[PDB]
Amino acid sequence: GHMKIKIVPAVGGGSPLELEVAPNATVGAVRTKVCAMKKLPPDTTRLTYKGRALKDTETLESLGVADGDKFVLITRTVGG
């Protein structure tokens, strides 16, 4: 099935994202999709969930995500 998740920037006025995501998708997949939308190199970004640093291969099932939950997107400089 799918759950609705929100992605909000840690800083600034960038738009939040709302994605419908499969529960067997992983954190890394979410980050790939967010970075595709944001036009960002993946390694310039991290996602946190309730403040926690995340392993890319967590599924959203294993992490205990629920419909409506939010991840925070932390970004860095992009010229490296």
Numbering used by the authors: -1 to 78
From the paper:
The first complete archaeal Ub modifier system, including E2 and E3 enzymes, was discovered in 2011 in Candidatus Caldiarchaeum subterraneum. C. subterraneum Ub (CsUb), E1, E2, and E3 are organized in a single operon, adjacent to a second E3 protein and a JAMM protease (CsRpn11) with high sequence similarity to eukaryotic Rpn119. We have shown that CsRpn11 is highly active on its own, cleaving both CsUb precursors and, at a later stage of the ubiquitination cascade, CsUb-conjugated substrate proteins. Our bioinformatic, structural, and biochemical results reveal unique features of the archaeal proteins, but also remarkable conceptual similarities with their eukaryotic counterparts.
Fitting to the thermophilic nature of C. subterraneum, CsUb is an extremely thermostable monomeric protein (Tm > 95 °C in circular dichroism heat-denaturation studies). The CsUb gene encodes for a precursor of 87 amino acids (Ub-pre). We could solve the structure via molecular replacement using human ubiquitin as a search model, revealing for CsUb the classical β-grasp fold with a two-residue insertion in the first-loop region. Likewise, a cluster analysis of Ub-like proteins reveals eukaryote-like Ub sequences in E2- and E3-containing archaea, while other prokaryotes only encode for more distant homologs. Again, the closest connections to eukaryotic ubiquitin are made by sequences from Asgard archaea and Caldiarchaeum (dark violet, magenta; enlarged inset), CsUb being up close with 31% sequence identity.
